[PDB]
Design a protein around this nucleic acid. Structure first.
Length: 34
RNA sequence: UGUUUAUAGCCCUUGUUGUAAUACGUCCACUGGGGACUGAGGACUGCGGCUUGCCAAGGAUGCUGACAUAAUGGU
């Protein structure tokens, strides 16, 4: 019956990064191999 | 022991600095974050907003990963 998905009203917008995450900042890695 | 700001000061009233501050009550169709649960519906209609179009506006989508010899679900 070829169910067509309804037109979702979600659109992608830029992520609002944290204030303290400025470029050129020292930071600690919390996961991964490093 | 007794006295009246002196070599400490205190209390009361008024003026002033004053439209003083603050506490508190209340309101903002003011705003900035953190966490959890949920994704029902299934072309288009509607009510709105910004401007043919776009949108947070009649219910989730997007970007990725890992794993299939296991993860999940069981019995």
């Amino acid at each position: 019956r070829e169910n067509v998905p309804k037109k979702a009203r979600k659109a992608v917008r830029p992520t609002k990064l944290r204030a303290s995450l400025a470029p050129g900042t020292v930071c600690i890695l919390l996961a991964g191999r490093f």
